[PDB]
């Protein structure tokens, strides 16, 4: 499935490539916005 449409899949592409805190293992900081 999922034929790669370029104009219809732009916000989904922006959400998938958005930066997230994917490097918080054993890192002590005062941030961390309720990460799941």
């Amino acid at each position: 499935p999922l034929v790669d449409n370029p104009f219809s899949t732009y916000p989904y592409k922006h959400v998938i490539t958005e930066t997230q805190p994917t490097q918080a293992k054993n890192q002590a900081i005062w941030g961390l916005v309720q990460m799941g």
Binding site: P1, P11, Y12, V15, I16, E18, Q20, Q34
Partner: protein, 434 residues
């Protein structure tokens, strides 16, 4: 006896029992991943009250989420017959957001339209019990209402939202509460002095997975076929007592669509999809001297009597071409539901399916509105010449006419349900297509 039937075997039975593949008398049930369900209260941000906006983030208590129920405590501002699905009316809308992306949104009118088309029998009755007062409760009565949500993940375990797989994205529900609810804080346009503000609570039913299943959800990518509601409000061509008004509404919809649905209504009176008249249940005091055909019997707002419906006929055009031959409003109201859903739809509510089974989860034929440059819904209205105050005129009339009070049906709501894909990977997600 039974043995004399078994022996009555011949060539005609080969297609039924020749080379047997299955039996009916021995069932093997499928083993499944161990799980548990817990109903957990969410904290509501903002302020509950009439006309207010509130919201909540779904806590990550379990791994997957399904059923969601919004509870309300309402009081009666008048006697039995003054309210109509007030918990449904109160919850003006609900918006589902993941990671700031709008996934879906439902409206009080949609809940009513949805119900009119897809709930049925005692499912529908029990639903009414959870949103209204149906045992002739009196003024001052207090009741706990439960409004189940109708987002894709609230309908089947099969679409449980993998909250665990969405670490990077919050899942939120935004709820708008109506400024007024009939028979609770207002009686028509009049505020009810002393009316109570609603109490509200949001509950989410969480699925707790076992170790292996939980891990797979957390680590693997997931693709969930989901359904979404598309909706815009429109003004109706003014129905008229002098002619048959008509209207062409551009169907500003997208995505593969399982069905279109719509209703005409009086925006003042929640759930009024038909005209009012002096026949029992069709107006306040209907059937007697005190009848007022401009004020509904709220407790009996809906009806199955099309004579009070305003739509004569309709067709859907795609790029200016007929989709199908023009059919009468009664087709969309009674037959489409018969053919494709199997329930009974109240007058004033219409359905046109593109799907063999629009009520199901599995796709079964769709209209891709993202490929129709200019789709249009063509509507012909009935002539509103019937004297609503005279049962002889109200009940003895013809197919193409309706009540003079049908000209109050100035609002039209056109809805569509489509199929999209919710994709989740590496802790984040959203819908594949816009």
């Amino acid at each position: 006896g039974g043995l004399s039937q078994l022996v009555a075997y011949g060539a005609q039975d080969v297609y039924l029992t020749g080379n047997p593949q299955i039996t009916f008398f021995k069932t093997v049930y499928r083993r499944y991943t161990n799980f548990a369900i817990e109903s957990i209260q969410q904290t509501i941000n903002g302020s509950v009250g009439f006309g207010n906006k509130v919201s909540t983030q779904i806590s990550r208590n379990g791994d997957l989420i399904t059923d969601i129920v919004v509870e309300f405590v309402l009081t009666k501002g008048g006697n039995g017959g003054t309210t109509y699905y007030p918990a449904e009316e109160l919850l003006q809308d609900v918006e589902l957001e993941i990671g700031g992306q709008r996934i879906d949104k439902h409206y009080n009118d949609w809940f009513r339209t949805y119900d009119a088309l897809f709930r049925m029998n005692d499912d529908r009755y029990n639903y009414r019990r959870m949103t209204d007062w149906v045992n002739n409760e009196l003024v001052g009565a207090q009741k706990r209402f439960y409004v189940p949500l109708i987002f894709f993940f609230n309908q089947t375990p099969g679409l449980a939202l993998p909250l665990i797989a969405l670490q990077y994205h919050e899942v939120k529900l935004y709820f708008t509460l109506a400024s007024q609810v009939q028979g609770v804080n207002y009686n028509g346009s009049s505020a009810i002095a002393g009316a109570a503000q609603p109490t509200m609570s949001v509950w989410v039913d969480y699925i707790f997975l076992d170790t292996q299943e939980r891990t797979r959800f957390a680590q693997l990518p997931h693709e969930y076929l989901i359904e979404q509601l598309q909706f815009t409000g429109s003004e109706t061509a003014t129905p008229s007592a002098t002619t048959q008004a008509s209207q062409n509404i551009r169907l500003n919809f997208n995505h593969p669509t399982k069905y279109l649905a719509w209703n005409f209504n009086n925006p003042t009176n929640y759930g009024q999809y038909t005209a009012l008249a002096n026949i029992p249940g069709a107006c306040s005091g209907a059937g007697t001297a005190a009848a007022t055909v401009t004020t509904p019997d709220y407790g009996n707002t809906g009806t199955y009597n099309e004579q009070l419906a305003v739509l004569d006929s309709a067709k859907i055009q795609l790029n200016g071409q007929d989709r199908f031959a023009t059919r009468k409003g009664s087709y969309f109201n009674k037959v489409q539901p018969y053919q494709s859903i199997g329930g009974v739809t109240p007058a004033g509510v219409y359905l046109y399916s593109f799907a063999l089974k629009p009520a199901g989860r599995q796709p079964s034929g769709t209209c891709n509105f993202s490929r129709i440059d200019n789709a249009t819904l063509s509507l012909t209205y009935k002539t509103c010449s019937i004297d609503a105050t005279s049962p002889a005129a109200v009940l003895g009339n013809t197919e193409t006419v309706t009540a003079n009070t049908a000209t109050l049906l100035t609002a039209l709501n056109i809805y569509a349900k489509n199929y999209n894909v919710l994709r989740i990977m590496s802790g984040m997600g959203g819908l594949a297509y816009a």
